[PDB]
Enzyme design. Structure first.
Site, PDB file in Angstrom:
ATOM      1  N   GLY A   2     -70.360 -76.254 -18.784  1.00 38.58           N
ATOM      2  CA  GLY A   2     -71.329 -75.162 -18.879  1.00 38.58           C
ATOM      3  C   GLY A   2     -70.698 -73.790 -18.784  1.00 38.58           C
ATOM      4  O   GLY A   2     -69.496 -73.661 -18.540  1.00 38.58           O
ATOM      5  N   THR A   3     -71.525 -72.760 -18.951  1.00 37.51           N
ATOM      6  CA  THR A   3     -71.051 -71.373 -18.928  1.00 37.51           C
ATOM      7  C   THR A   3     -70.719 -70.981 -17.487  1.00 37.51           C
ATOM      8  O   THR A   3     -71.192 -71.616 -16.541  1.00 37.51           O
ATOM      9  CB  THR A   3     -72.067 -70.370 -19.536  1.00 37.51           C
ATOM     10  OG1 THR A   3     -73.153 -70.145 -18.628  1.00 37.51           O
ATOM     11  CG2 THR A   3     -72.616 -70.858 -20.886  1.00 37.51           C
ATOM     12  N   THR A   4     -69.900 -69.945 -17.324  1.00 43.91           N
ATOM     13  CA  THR A   4     -69.442 -69.540 -15.995  1.00 43.91           C
ATOM     14  C   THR A   4     -70.548 -68.792 -15.255  1.00 43.91           C
ATOM     15  O   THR A   4     -71.240 -67.949 -15.836  1.00 43.91           O
ATOM     16  CB  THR A   4     -68.177 -68.658 -16.051  1.00 43.91           C
ATOM     17  OG1 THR A   4     -67.198 -69.269 -16.900  1.00 43.91           O
ATOM     18  CG2 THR A   4     -67.578 -68.471 -14.651  1.00 43.91           C
TER      19      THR A   4
END
Ligand SMILES: *C[C@@](C)(O)[C@](*)(O)[C@H](Cc1ccccc1)NC(=O)[C@H](Cc1ccc(OC)cc1)NC(=O)[C@H](C)NC(=O)CN1CCOCC1
Ligand SMILES: *C[C@@](C)(O)[C@](*)(O)[C@H](Cc1ccccc1)NC(=O)[C@H](Cc1ccc(OC)cc1)NC(=O)[C@H](C)NC(=O)CN1CCOCC1
Ligand SMILES: [Cl-]
Ligand SMILES: [Mg+2]
Ligand SMILES: [Mg+2]
Ligand SMILES: [Mg+2]
Ligand SMILES: [Mg+2]
Lengths: 204, 244, 231, 226, 241, 250, 243, 196
Positions: G29-31
């Site tokens: 997933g995105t940070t």
């Protein structure tokens, strides 16, 4: 309206010397109308005797219920239920209907087959045990039966004397009550014989 | 989820058999033999115990023959614990009937209800069947003396003489040979014991390996009595027929 | 492979294969497009037929006077999710006297789809939806995928060969966003967007479905000779 | 009913009369109103007779199971807590009024509990129709630092006030003494101040006095062999 | 081999999921130790804060279950916290129903019974934890009772749990063979804590700073944990003798 | 979060075996030896207290348990399974019997109820059988003294004497030689102690042996006086000292 | 083998492989990050711009719970939403009964026990998110990170998703180089920098920054999004420091 | 009953009479109506003895469970738990409860929960049948920030008068003092308080 006095009836039990007696009347009515002259109120499960007064539908229902329970008891235990144990079973069963009770006055009578001890007990409609040495009374003429028993009774009567005493207690109590009488039965119970006698009484 | 671990106890095979019922019958085939024989004046139930040890208390023991009511007994082949669940159910059904109708339950009616319970475990619920076959011995005033069997399929049938458990093939051949319709209880007792004596996997048939019972209308004055035989009574009946 | 038997199983790389297979039913679905200005939001959908004797399956469903959707994938799943939206819009009205925000509608669909991705027995929804509406913050377009992911967009498309229409709208962005106070020009722009996803077939009178909602325009669906104008 | 509880130096004592009534009639002249919950937790009962018997038997049963589960001797506060929660749930319809007493590892205890589920602590307590007659005696004669012998005297005196002055109470006095370090001693018919005098006459009838229509032997046995 | 996935018997009469739950017990690589004084029960556990970004005050495997009962867990923290919440609820319910504080051993039995159910019922996994309950019980005095994923439990004179439990165990066995008593003959809990730390240092072969330990103490009518600074006061006194 | 295991985990295999019951019996074989011997005026039940650590207080782990004042149980197999069965057996003795009849159940009927619970674990959904065999010793007024074994299947059998667990084959043989129908309780205790030495490797004293009797009524253990017909529990756990006294004349 | 096919099964190591597989969804997933400051907490997240067609500022990822708690997560977005919805029910039932708003450590265990419950049965799947959350309560500021196992701890700073390692290294430098503390307005700027530095690992698509904060002084202990001038001031700071 | 709780400089004091009535009969003359729900959170009970006990036992349970999980509850939190029970079960309960507690942050606080289950935070509160007779007295004589000895006297004089005029109040006057110093139980017998 009052369920304990729609049908009428009485039961009395007494202890004597190595014996017990239990007696009942035979009437079943709907208030003023006498309907049946043969409605017995005393039942037995092996050697334990149960008299039941009060609402007749509940008398019948409870007899069938205790026949059921004592039959199963006997199958599982491989012996007949004794009066002290049956007394506890009556109490349990009545109290589980605490807030919708059976409208009855049960009376237990019998001789413990191991110890030979005569035993009688009475209950209220929700299972409070009255274990008495002398006598137990129940029904619409209970006041009258209490009076007869309290004056007539003496301890250690022989079976054939006890018979006269219990019969006179029942007959005379019944005659002062509109809803009791119409016949009577008296069981005399010794350790291994039980005589049953139908009394001649006034039919009004 | 949980589907992974479900054995699926209530399915058909491609041949149209019920796996678990067939496998329960296989279990029952290794249990102690029980024999029922019906005469004109009574019924015999005789069963062989499987667990012999000199130390087993036999006079207070009951693995094979159980009382259902005053007129009906059963002999058990299979898992004893499974059988006790069903026995207590049948005792309750008998007493419900008596409560409802004020008459003792007709034998077939009791048999049918127990058999219907067994059937249910083969069609729904995903539970294993009861690993039990029963021989029912009883009397009622419609059909007189009756013998039935039921098995884990919930199928029941009536018999003049029957065996369940181990070596039933051998036992059924021998019963077919010596059974006759006019036969009496005393002859049927002898037949039951001889049949067990030949089919047993033990070296000899002795009182300590047996449970035995009769239902006779041979009571005082036209009534019916169940006699579950005590150890000494089986020992005497083993001499009286010359198997010891 | 061993990890695609149900929705309750992660693969070793952290994927949910039953959700990915549900996603695959969308790609087999007939194409549909959505786009909006600041004043109107438009849905264009290519309806598909079984054969020449059949009707062309309806792809557009009204949810309220100010909201509705287009579907691609399993139609009965669109019927379930649209009924849920109808009820949620309805609840907002009866209880709060409030037209349901399109953003909230999307959040409600997301959460409803999610429950079927985490529990045993159930399956993911096998349908993608484009939701348009006009609420208190203007015109809106939403893309719903049955993974539960919901995304607010100026324009998009889903279904078979939807990448064409999606590239066109990616180029056209600065033109169609400006089409304020002009319904017929916004529809035209959507009909040209959907045309970039056609092959062999082209847009006929009983093949095309359009819907519009906006400032003083209830959500209305145009089918049949009421779309002849735009072919 | 008259029931009392009295705290003393090394324990607690409870007492009760032995009359039960049905309207103005005496149903039983020698009931046992001292109910054992556990070996060292006893309570005196007033109110609806069947309810008091059922409630003490149920809580006694559950106290026994709790004692086995925990490997500990039961505490009076546990009997009290279970009784109060049960009685409160039934909103007074289970008409048990109990004096709950005993000894446990924590010491000696004396409580009362009402049918609606309220509880009290005290050094001396009384319940039932004769509670006012009993409390008059307790309020006049109680002191702190009572011996065992003084407490039995006070408790039975308090019951006697109930027996003589309250029509709801009569017959005999029962006592149970629960002392720290010792077995509880239950003194059934500790006092017997109401033995019925000799009757003037015997009412034993001549055999044959009662007219009979029919006789028969009743079969009580099982179904016979042979 | 689906008898290895759920809690049914294997052919050798074993429950593999229970045994594998025992292995999860050591996933944290922490050792714990419990001992009894005259007046008290002390529990000590290694505290390891690997990441610099962690708030070290929130990193704990010791729990105050009730006023009188402490619990230290050997196992992963989510299962530990599940066990802690349940034990708190059970201890509070017990007090409400029966009118006195739940004893250490009865809570231990209760949590052990719950663990037994997970070994018999298929839908529930065992918790991968060992739970050491400590108190000064009003009837039994200083008490240590320990529960595991098999549903087994027993009382202890002293105990240790973790990867190096056997080293600590024999060290303690050897002390009680010398002293010939069930407990640390010592008046103050401070000196019993010092004993506990001292004997862990010897058995493990490692020295400890104030931030390497976590300590819990049970006295009559309270259980409490020590701050880093109360531990430094403990570590100082050991060094000066 | 739902229990979806509503199907049996014990089923019949093609040979007719119930595998989980067999495997439960195998767990019982691995368990420590326990035994029971019936005498004329009593019953003795006994087992080894195999302690897991020597830091464990083995006094706190009770392998021999009171179920009613006249009934006791010991086991072999999985101890946690035994502990919950003891809890349920105690409870069913009240709910299915004492609360109905006002008296404790006879031994065979309490055995019957425990047997039932164990049978249900052999057929109900989502459970395994109990991995224990019990020996239940007791007395009741109309049957006298009795001794029953209960197995994972739910089957129970009455015994004059028996043993279960690890060294049961050898112990059963030892008891066949020594048992007769004229044994007094002390002789049965002496035989129990002899039989159990064969199966124990290490220390053999009152701290490593757990032994209880069903014998005479113990009025001093009742806790109260004043009721003639309440004479006390027939179940008594022998102390460490009482066992050691009998080991010196061994 | 087959130990990894069903949630809640222990492997022979003592591991629940399905939870470890849920972690892979998180790592994908995105940070997202959180930074604890003097009197508050800051939350930030990388939102990948898949397309020009995404409406800027309109696909909000950070979520408020009650009025004082922020939640950000990386992984399966709907799983995070489900967890926040439950978080909201837990915060509401707490406030209903006890009146005071839910303390952050209390809230953290409510989420912890719920996430852990989804590792107890094979009829459910574990959560495919790691969730960073916190806020201000009566005892001060608190920041937490919660993994698919139900494991959570308190943090000085926290990071998860694809750029976690880069972000973790950056957070470690802030802790070392600001020992007496960090202000709320510093942390907003630093949060921007770290998301920009962490974007190197997701560098194909361009991204949109989103920040939020609770601070006793700056927001009165409530959770607010960083908007307008203060967001741009933080972006400018971040752009300056990558170049 | 006559009950009151009074905040003062160093904390809060709770006071109560000791009479329990069964009609005109005094069932208990040395009743303890001040009950502890937490170390420094106490309540005064009036109304049904059974109802207020059942409520107080539940609250004690809720706060012990609060303590295990979340640390020491505030006095407001304790009052909220009483309120929830009283409000939701208003048809079936007759309970008038005063909740009083001491925090170090908030100092002494008093919340009163009358019949309907509303909550009211107050500097002091009075309740029970006997409180009617002292509304005038208490309003005229209460000041904020009184000393401990002043507050003890204010309560002693107030409940003295409630007891004098109310037949349903009497016996001893019990008080509980709640400060940073701890918990102090006081008692005052009729021979002291009557002659005031
Ligand atoms: C002094 C007295 C007699 O009241 C004292 O409290 C007795 C206590 C007692 C305790 C244990 C065993 C035996 C006696 N109580 C009684 O004797 C009660 C009195 C009573 C009658 C009626 C009501 O009605 C609300 C309450 C108390 N007597 C009984 O309970 C008798 C045996 N049974 C009945 O009167 C019939 N019951 C009355 C209650 O409603 C159900 C039917
Ligand atoms: C003024 C006074 C003394 O009444 C005060 O409010 C008492 C508060 C108190 C007492 C004991 C412990 C803790 C607190 N309350 C009582 O003494 C109550 C008065 C009361 C009774 C009933 C109702 O019912 C709505 C309200 C107030 N006394 C009791 O509760 C006594 C113990 N029980 C009964 O009188 C039996 N009641 C009678 C009415 O129907 C319910 C059962
Ligand atoms: Cl339990
Ligand atoms: Mg007449
Ligand atoms: Mg007439
Ligand atoms: Mg399991
Ligand atoms: Mg007054």
């Amino acid at each position: 309206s009052d369920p304990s006095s729609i049908n009428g009836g009485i039961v009395v039990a007494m202890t004597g010397k190595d014996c017990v007696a239990i007696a009942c009347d035979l009437r079943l009515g709907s208030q003023s109308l006498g309907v049946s002259n043969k409605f017995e109120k005393i039942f037995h499960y092996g050697h334990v005797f149960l008299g039941i007064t009060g609402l007749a539908t509940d008398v019948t229902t409870l007899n069938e219920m205790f026949r059921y329970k004592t039959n199963l008891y006997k199958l599982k235990e491989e012996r007949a239920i004794e009066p002290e144990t049956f007394t506890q079973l009556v109490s349990s069963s009545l109290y589980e209907r605490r807030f919708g009770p059976y409208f009855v006055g049960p009376v237990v009578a019998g001789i413990n087959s191991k110890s030979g001890k005569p035993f009688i007990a009475g209950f209220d409609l929700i299972g409070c045990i009255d274990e008495a040495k002398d006598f137990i009374v129940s029904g619409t003429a209970s006041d009258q039966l209490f009076g007869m028993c309290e004056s007539l009774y003496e301890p250690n009567l022989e079976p054939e004397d006890l018979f006269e005493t219990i019969s006179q207690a029942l007959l005379n109590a019944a005659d002062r009550d509109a809803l009791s009488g119409w016949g009577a039965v008296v069981y005399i119970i010794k350790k291994d014989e039980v005589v049953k006698r139908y009394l001649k009484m006034r039919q009004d | 989820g949980s589907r992974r671990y479900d054995s699926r106890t209530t399915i058909f095979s491609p041949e149209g058999r019920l796996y678990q019922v067939e496998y329960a019958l296989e279990s029952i085939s290794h249990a102690g033999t029980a024999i029922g024989i019906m005469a004109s004046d009574g019924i015999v139930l005789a069963a062989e115990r499987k667990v012999t040890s000199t130390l087993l208390e036999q006079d207070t023991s009951t693995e094979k023959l159980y009382k259902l009511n005053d007129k009906i007994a059963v002999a058990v082949a299979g898992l004893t614990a499974d059988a006790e669940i069903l026995i207590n159910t049948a005792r309750i059904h008998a007493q419900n009937y008596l409560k409802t109708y004020n008459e003792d339950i007709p034998v077939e009616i009791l048999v049918r209800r127990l058999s219907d319970i067994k059937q249910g475990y083969t069609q729904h619920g995903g539970l294993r069947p009861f690993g039990v076959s029963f021989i029912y011995a009883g009397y009622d005033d419609r059909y007189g003396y009756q013998l039935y069997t039921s098995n884990p399929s919930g199928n029941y049938t009536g018999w003049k003489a029957i065996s369940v458990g181990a070596n039933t093939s051998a036992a059924q051949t021998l019963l077919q040979m010596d059974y006759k319709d006019d036969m009496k209880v005393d002859d049927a007792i002898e037949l039951a014991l001889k049949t067990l004596s030949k089919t047993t996997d033990s070296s000899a048939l002795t009182y300590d390996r047996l449970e035995f019972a009769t239902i006779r209308k041979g009571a005082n004055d036209g009534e019916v009595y169940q006699k579950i035989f005590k150890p000494q009574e089986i020992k005497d009946i083993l001499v009286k027929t010359g198997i010891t | 492979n061993n990890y695609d038997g149900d929705t309750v199983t992660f693969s070793p790389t952290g994927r949910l294969f039953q959700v990915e297979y549900a996603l695959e039913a969308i790609k087999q679905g007939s194409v549909t497009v959505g786009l909006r200005s600041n004043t109107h939001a438009v849905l264009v959908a290519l309806k598909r037929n079984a054969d020449e004797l059949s009707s062309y399956q309806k792809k557009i469903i009204k949810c309220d006077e100010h909201m509705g959707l287009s579907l691609a994938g399993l139609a009965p799943d669109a019927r379930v999710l649209s009924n849920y939206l109808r009820q949620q819009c309805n609840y907002s009205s009866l209880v709060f006297n409030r037209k349901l925000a399109v953003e909230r509608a999307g959040h409600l669909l997301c959460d409803k789809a999610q429950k079927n991705t985490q529990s045993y027995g159930g399956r993911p929804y096998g349908v993608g939806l484009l939701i348009i509406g006009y609420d208190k913050s203007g015109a809106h377009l939403l893309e719903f995928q049955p993974s539960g992911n919901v995304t607010e967009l100026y324009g998009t498309a889903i279904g078979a060969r939807s990448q064409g229409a999606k590239t066109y709208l990616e180029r056209t962005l600065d033109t169609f966003i400006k089409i304020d106070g002009n319904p017929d020009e916004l529809i035209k722009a959507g009909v040209e967007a959907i045309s970039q996803s056609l092959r062999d077939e082209s847009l006929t009178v009983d093949n095309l479905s359009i819907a519009i909602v906006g400032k003083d325009t209830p959500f209305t669906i145009y089918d049949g000779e009421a779309v002849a104008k735009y072919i | 009913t008259t029931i009392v509880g009295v705290k003393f130096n090394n324990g607690v004592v409870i007492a009760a009369d032995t009359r039960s009534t049905q309207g103005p009639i005496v149903a039983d002249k020698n009931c046992a109103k001292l109910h054992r919950i556990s070996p060292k937790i006893w309570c005196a009962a007033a109110g609806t007779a069947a309810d008091t018997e059922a409630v003490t038997q149920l809580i006694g049963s559950n106290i026994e199971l709790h004692s086995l589960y925990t490997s500990r001797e039961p505490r009076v506060v546990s009997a009290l807590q279970m009784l109060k929660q049960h009685l409160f749930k039934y909103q007074g319809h289970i008409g048990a009024y109990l004096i709950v007493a005993g000894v446990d590892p924590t010491g000696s205890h004396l409580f009362s509990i009402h049918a609606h589920g309220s509880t009290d602590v005290g050094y001396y307590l009384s319940l039932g129709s004769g509670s006012l007659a009993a409390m008059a005696v307790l309020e006049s004669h109680w002191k702190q630092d009572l011996t065992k012998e003084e407490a039995i005297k006070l408790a039975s005196d308090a019951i006697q006030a109930g027996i003589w002055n309250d029509l709801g109470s009569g017959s005999n006095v029962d006592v149970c003494v629960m002392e720290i370090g010792k077995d509880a001693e239950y003194l059934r018919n500790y006092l017997t101040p109401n033995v019925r005098e000799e009757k003037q006459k015997s009412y034993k009838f001549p055999r044959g006095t009662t007219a009979v229509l029919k006789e028969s032997i009743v079969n009580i046995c099982d179904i016979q062999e042979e | 081999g689906y008898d290895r996935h759920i809690t049914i018997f294997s052919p050798e009469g074993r429950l593999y999921q229970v045994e594998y739950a025992f292995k999860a017990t050591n996933q944290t690589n922490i050792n714990s130790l419990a001992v009894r004084g005259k007046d008290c029960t002390v529990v000590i556990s290694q505290k390891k804060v690997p990441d610099k970004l962690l708030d070290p005050t929130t990193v704990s495997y010791i729990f105050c279950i009730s006023r009188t009962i402490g619990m230290v867990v050997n196992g992963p923290i989510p299962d530990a916290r599940n066990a802690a919440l349940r034990a708190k609820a059970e201890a509070a319910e017990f007090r409400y129903k029966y009118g006195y504080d739940m004893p250490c051993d009865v809570l231990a039995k209760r949590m052990a019974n719950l663990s037994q159910i997970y070994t018999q019922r298929a839908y529930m996994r065992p918790l991968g934890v060992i739970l050491t309950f400590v108190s000064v019980d009003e009837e039994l005095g200083p008490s240590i009772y320990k529960t595991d994923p098999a549903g087994y439990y027993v009382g202890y004179k002293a105990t240790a749990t973790g990867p190096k439990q056997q080293e600590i165990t024999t060290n303690l066995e050897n002390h009680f063979k010398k002293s010939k008593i069930d407990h640390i003959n010592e008046e103050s809990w401070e000196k019993v804590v010092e004993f506990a730390i001292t004997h862990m240092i010897d058995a493990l072969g490692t020295e400890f700073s104030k931030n390497d330990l976590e300590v819990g103490v049970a006295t009559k009518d309270k259980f409490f944990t020590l701050s880093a600074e109360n531990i430094e006061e403990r570590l100082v006194a050991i060094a000066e003798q | 979060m739902t229990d979806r295991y509503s199907f049996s985990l014990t089923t019949f295999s093609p040979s007719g075996k119930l595998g989980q019951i067999d495997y439960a019996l195998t767990a019982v074989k691995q368990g420590v030896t326990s035994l029971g011997i019936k005498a004329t005026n009593g019953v003795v039940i006994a087992t080894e207290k195999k302690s897991s650590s020597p830091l464990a207080m083995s006094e706190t782990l009770s392998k021999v348990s009171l179920l009613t004042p006249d009934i006791g149980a010991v086991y072999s197999g999985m101890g946690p399974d035994y502990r919950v069965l003891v809890d349920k057996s105690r409870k069913v003795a009240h709910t299915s019997y004492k609360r109905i009849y006002g008296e404790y159940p006879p031994t065979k009927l309490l055995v019957s109820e425990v047997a039932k619970i164990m049978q249900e674990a052999t057929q109900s959904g989502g459970v395994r059988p109990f991995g224990v065999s019990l020996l239940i010793a007791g007395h009741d007024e109309f049957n006298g003294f009795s001794l029953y074994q209960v197995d994972p299947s739910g089957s129970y059998f009455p015994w004059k004497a028996t043993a279960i667990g690890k060294g049961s084959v050898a112990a059963k043989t030892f008891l066949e030689k020594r048992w007769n129908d004229e044994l007094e309780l002390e002789d049965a205790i002496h035989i129990a102690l002899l039989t159990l030495k064969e199966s124990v490797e290490g220390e053999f004293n009152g701290d490593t042996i757990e032994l209880a009797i069903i014998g005479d009524e113990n009025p001093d253990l009742l806790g109260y006086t004043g009721i003639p017909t309440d004479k006390g529990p027939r179940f008594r756990k022998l102390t460490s000292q009482e066992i050691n006294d009998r080991l010196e004349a061994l | 083998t087959g130990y990894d096919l069903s949630n809640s099964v222990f492997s022979p190591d003592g591991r629940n492989f399905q939870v470890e597989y849920a972690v892979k969804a998180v790592e994908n997933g995105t940070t997202s990050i959180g930074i604890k400051c003097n009197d508050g907490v800051v939350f930030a997240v990388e939102k990948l711009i898949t397309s020009k067609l995404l409406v800027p500022q309109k696909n909000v990822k950070i979520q408020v719970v009650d009025r004082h708690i922020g939640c950000v997560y990386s992984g399966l977005i709907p799983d995070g939403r489900h967890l926040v919805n439950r978080g909201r029910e837990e915060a509401a039932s707490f406030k209903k009964l006890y009146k005071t708003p839910i303390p952050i450590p209390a809230f953290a265990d409510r989420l912890g026990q719920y996430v852990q419950a989804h590792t107890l049965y094979n009829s459910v799947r574990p959560f495919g998110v790691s969730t960073i959350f916190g806020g201000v309560d009566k005892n001060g500021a608190h920041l937490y990170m919660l993994e698919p196992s139900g494991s959570y701890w308190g943090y000085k700073g926290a990071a998860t998703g694809k750029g976690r390692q880069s972000a973790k290294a950056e957070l470690e430098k802030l802790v070392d180089h600001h020992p007496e503390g960090l202000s709320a307005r510093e942390a907003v700027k630093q949060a921007a920098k770290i998301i920009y530095l962490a974007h190197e690992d997701n560098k194909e698509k361009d991204f949109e920054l989103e920040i939020s904060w609770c601070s006793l002084s700056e927001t009165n202990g409530l959770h607010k999004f960083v908007k307008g001038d203060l967001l741009q001031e933080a972006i400018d700071f971040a752009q300056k420091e990558i170049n | 009953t006559s009950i009151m709780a009074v905040t003062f400089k160093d904390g809060v004091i709770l006071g109560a009479d000791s009479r329990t009535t069964t009609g005109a009969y005094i069932a208990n003359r040395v009743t303890d109506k001040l009950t502890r729900v937490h170390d420094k959170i106490w309540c005064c009970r009036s109304g049904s003895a059974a109802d207020t006990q059942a409520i107080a036992d539940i609250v004690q349970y809720h706060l012990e469970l609060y303590t295990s999980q979340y640390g020491t509850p505030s006095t407001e939190t304790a009052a909220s738990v009483f309120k929830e029970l009283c409000y939701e079960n208003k048809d079936n309960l007759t309970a008038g409860i005063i909740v009083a507690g001491y925090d170090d942050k908030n100092k002494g606080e008093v919340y009163t929960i009358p019949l309907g289950g509303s909550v009211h935070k107050l500097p002091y509160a009075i309740a029970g049948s006997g409180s009617t007779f002292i509304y005038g007295y208490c309003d005229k004589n209460f000041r904020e920030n009184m000393s401990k000895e002043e507050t003890v006297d204010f309560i002693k004089h107030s409940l003295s008068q409630a007891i004098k005029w109310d037949g349903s109040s009497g016996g001893v006057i019990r008080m509980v003092v709640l400060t940073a110093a701890g918990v102090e139980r006081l008692i005052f017998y009729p021979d002291e308080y009557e002659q005031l």
